[PDB]
Ligand binder design. Structure first.
Ligand code: GOJ
Length: 119
């Protein structure tokens, strides 16, 4: 029933993601000195520190908006990878599976709480 509960649930999931070794390449914005052509390929950079900062600033209205930004971290890695066998892309796929497994109940509970609110 709690329409605000998603925020702490997302904070806790972000904490789990930061402890995951698979999140290392994605914890901060991609370094343009390490990947000089990055912005030629990727239009909208995104990383987990930016997601956490947006959440903590009260700049997400719903968990769907947070989920769109986290999914952008993964689609950027898939677009930038030179190979479907690359180390960083392989880390993104495992981290995406972990994220999707945990965000599903957050989205469901929020949408159900919102439907109850507008009943
Ligand atoms: C973090 C920026 O780099 C990537 O996303 C990447 C690099 N190789 N495969 C994917």
């Amino acid at each position: 029933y709690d329409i605000q509960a998603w925020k702490k649930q997302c904070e806790e999931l972000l904490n789990l993601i930061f402890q995951c070794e698979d999140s290392e390449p994605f914890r901060q914005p991609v370094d343009l000195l390490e990947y000089p052509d990055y912005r030629d390929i990727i239009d909208t950079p995104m990383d987990f520190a930016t997601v956490r900062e947006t959440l903590e600033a009260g700049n997400y209205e719903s968990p769907m908006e947070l989920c769109k930004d986290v999914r952008l971290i993964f689609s950027n890695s898939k677009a930038y990878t030179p190979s479907k066998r690359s180390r960083i892309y392989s880390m993104s796929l495992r981290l995406s599976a972990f994220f999707e497994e945990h965000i599903s109940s957050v989205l469901s509970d929020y949408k159900s709480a919102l439907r109850f609110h507008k009943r």
